[PDB]
Amino acid sequence: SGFRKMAFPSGKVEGCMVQVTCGTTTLNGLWLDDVVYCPRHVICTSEDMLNPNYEDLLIRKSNHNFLVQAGNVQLRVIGHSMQNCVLKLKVDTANPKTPKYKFVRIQPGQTFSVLACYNGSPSGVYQCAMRPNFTIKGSFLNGSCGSVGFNIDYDCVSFCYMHHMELPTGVHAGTDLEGNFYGPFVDRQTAQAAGTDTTITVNVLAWLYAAVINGDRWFLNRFTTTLNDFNLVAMKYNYEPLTQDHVDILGPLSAQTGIAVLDMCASLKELLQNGMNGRTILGSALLEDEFTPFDVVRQC
Amino acid sequence: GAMSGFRKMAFPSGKVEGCMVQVTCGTTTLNGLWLDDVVYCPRHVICTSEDMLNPNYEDLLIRKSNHNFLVQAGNVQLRVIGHSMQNCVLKLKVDTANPKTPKYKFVRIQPGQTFSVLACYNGSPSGVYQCAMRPNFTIKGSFLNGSCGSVGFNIDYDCVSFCYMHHMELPTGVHAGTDLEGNFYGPFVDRQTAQAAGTDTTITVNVLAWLYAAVINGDRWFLNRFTTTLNDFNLVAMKYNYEPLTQDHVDILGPLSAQTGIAVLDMCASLKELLQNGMNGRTILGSALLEDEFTPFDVVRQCS
Ligand SMILES: NC(=O)c1ccnc(Cl)c1
Numbered sequence: 077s078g079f080r081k082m083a084f085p086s087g088k089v090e091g092c093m094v095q096v097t098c099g100t101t102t103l104n105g106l107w108l109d110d111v112v113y114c115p116r117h118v119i120c121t122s123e124d125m126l127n128p129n130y131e132d133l134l135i136r137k138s139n140h141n142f143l144v145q146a147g148n149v150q151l152r153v154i155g156h157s158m159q160n161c162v163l164k165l166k167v168d169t170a171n172p173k174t175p176k177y178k179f180v181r182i183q184p185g186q187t188f189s190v191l192a193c194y195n196g197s198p199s200g201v202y203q204c205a206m207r208p209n210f211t212i213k214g215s216f217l218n219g220s221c222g223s224v225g226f227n228i229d230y231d232c233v234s235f236c237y238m239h240h241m242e243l244p245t246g247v248h249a250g251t252d253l254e255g256n257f258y259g260p261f262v263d264r265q266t267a268q269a270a271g272t273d274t275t276i277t278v279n280v281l282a283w284l285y286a287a288v289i290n291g292d293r294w295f296l297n298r299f300t301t302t303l304n305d306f307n308l309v310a311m312k313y314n315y316e317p318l319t320q321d322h323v324d325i326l327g328p329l330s331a332q333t334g335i336a337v338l339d340m341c342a343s344l345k346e347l348l349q350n351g352m353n354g355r356t357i358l359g360s361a362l363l364e365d366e367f368t369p370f371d372v373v374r375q376c
Numbered sequence: 377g378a379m380s381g382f383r384k385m386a387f388p389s390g391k392v393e394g395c396m397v398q399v400t401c402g403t404t405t406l407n408g409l410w411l412d413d414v415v416y417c418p419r420h421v422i423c424t425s426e427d428m429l430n431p432n433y434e435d436l437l438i439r440k441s442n443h444n445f446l447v448q449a450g451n452v453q454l455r456v457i458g459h460s461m462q463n464c465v466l467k468l469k470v471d472t473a474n475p476k477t478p479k480y481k482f483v484r485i486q487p488g489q490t491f492s493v494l495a496c497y498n499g500s501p502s503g504v505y506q507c508a509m510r511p512n513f514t515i516k517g518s519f520l521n522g523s524c525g526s527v528g529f530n531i532d533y534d535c536v537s538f539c540y541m542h543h544m545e546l547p548t549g550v551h552a553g554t555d556l557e558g559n560f561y562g563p564f565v566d567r568q569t570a571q572a573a574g575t576d577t578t579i580t581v582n583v584l585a586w587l588y589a590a591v592i593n594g595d596r597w598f599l600n601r602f603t604t605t606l607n608d609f610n611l612v613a614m615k616y617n618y619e620p621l622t623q624d625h626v627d628i629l630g631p632l633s634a635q636t637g638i639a640v641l642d643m644c645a646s647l648k649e650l651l652q653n654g655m656n657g658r659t660i661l662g663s664a665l666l667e668d669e670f671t672p673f674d675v676v677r678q679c680s
Pocket residue numbers: 612648649651652653
């Protein structure tokens with residue numbers, strides 16, 4: 077096979093990772109300009125995390141409660157504020173390694189890279205998608221609280237995700253860099269589970285388009301389906317329903333390969349109902365759903 | 377537990393990004409690795425496309441002078457003040473030492489071992505991925521256009537061990553290359569002649585490490601109460617295109633065996649049953665496939 081999944085080069089983000097400590101709790105912060113971003117639940121004690129009043133707890137902590145280390149260099153916290161579920165610590169020194177960046181919010185199914193960190197130090201990087209149930213697959217060994225997800229576009233880092241918690245089912249959940257959660261999760265110690273997950277249909281179709289571009293063509297068939305008829309079948313197999321927007325996002329690949337979206341949908345439908353019958357697609361016996369249509373455009 | 381839902385990660389690529397440069401000889405452009413005052417790149421940068429069928433590298437190199445080589449780091453042009461060939465790697469001495477040179481080593485890896493590749497085009501890092509040296513000495517790389525000179529590496533305590541440089545794509549879609557001393561992995565040559573990679577095989581010792589990691593995390597559905605001899609395991613495994621296991625591999629898995637109380641040959645018998653029965657819509661550590669690109673070294677560290 078060819079097509080390998082890649083993460084973005086992580087150097088621009090490595091330069092921003094610092095260590096934030098409040099009391100006993102230590103986690104990762106993102107240091108951009110003269111502000112350090114981290115999950116607000118760093119300020120919690122064991123008594124506090126069962127039902128905390130964060131903004132009340134925040135305003136009554138002194139800046140000296142917060143211990144920020146960039147390597148072996150101490151950043152002095154000169155202010156602090158809360159924005160939804162992210163804590164913003166103002167420090168007296170701007171990060172000279174600050175890249176060109178933006179805070180963006182992504183949609184379930186969209187991909188990004190995560191720079192897994194521990195105690196402010198980068199441990200590894202991996203490529204992932206926002207699952208339809210708003211979780212990210214990854215273990216306790218795939219980064220701890222405050223690790224961030226990002227895309228890179230030209231020289232500009234788009235931060236889209238910050239890790240807040242690892243759920244017991246081998247996934248993690250978090251917010252955008254403005255503190256808004258992805259999914260119906262809350263940042264307190266308390267019984268939470270992710271909803272049943274589904275396959276990102278638009279990404280599977282993107283991946284089948286990539287297979288055609290690579291000359292893997294055995295699954296193409298002469299049939300077309302209606303968007304509804306496909307959805308009736310897809311939903312039975314826990315595939316996400318395909319929307320007209322998804323169809324539109326796939327437009328370029330259809331013109332680029334000659335395979336209309338509802339043509340490829342008849343291929344995928346037959347794959348779901350009859351399996352691959354011992355065959356592979358791009359060398360895999362499994363359908364891939366963490367490549368977006370844009371990922372295909374870029375790599376292919 | 378700890379590894380539930382584990383994802384393979386590449387090493388953070390920043391230390392290597394600071395070393396990537398663009399090397400151009402005549403009409404050919406590819407990536408070089410700039411460490412101290414030396415840029416390393418594939419020697420086939422000095423070939424025209426005619427030359428690539430039967431290049432005489434000694435004859436082509438003797439005809440080059442330092443000013444034939446254009447080395448660019450961003451918008452800065454580095455001056456080449458020397459050039460020499462070491463096996464299939466060209467070494468360009470430049471008049472500037474790279475201020476971003478990390479602590480580094482050159483090391484040769486064996487098949488089954490893993491590393492990260494920073495895929496670059498025209499000196500610019502494009503993406504990073506984690507992989508293993510396949511048993512047939514190839515790596516399964518990106519879509520790839522002109523990523524020659526992209527390097528593979530490990531990082532240990534901020535020291536970058538460089539182990540791979542990309543030289544060619546084989547007709548099979550996979551990629552072949554050298555260590556940083558210019559010696560190829562496998563029976564390949566930097567030549568556009570008919571070359572074919574051998575049949576690839578699953579890295580059995582890595583799969584066994586993965587199964588041991590699953591057990592350490594309480595994922596036990598695939599265990600059986602059988603054991604096997606080493607030779608009975610290899611007769612079965614080869615017939616699924618799994619690498620034969622050696623006593624060395626058995627010793628390596630020793631710490632995982634002691635941590636779980638499952639003898640290696642007991643786990644070999646479980647793997648034998650997995651091959652017999654398949655994983656059809658079942659998962660181990662949250663993955664629907666048997667992972668063979670995570671090594672015992674990594675498992676033992678991450679599951680102390
Ligand atoms: N003899 C065996 O234990 C065996 C292993 C794998 N597959 C089959 Cl069918 C049989």
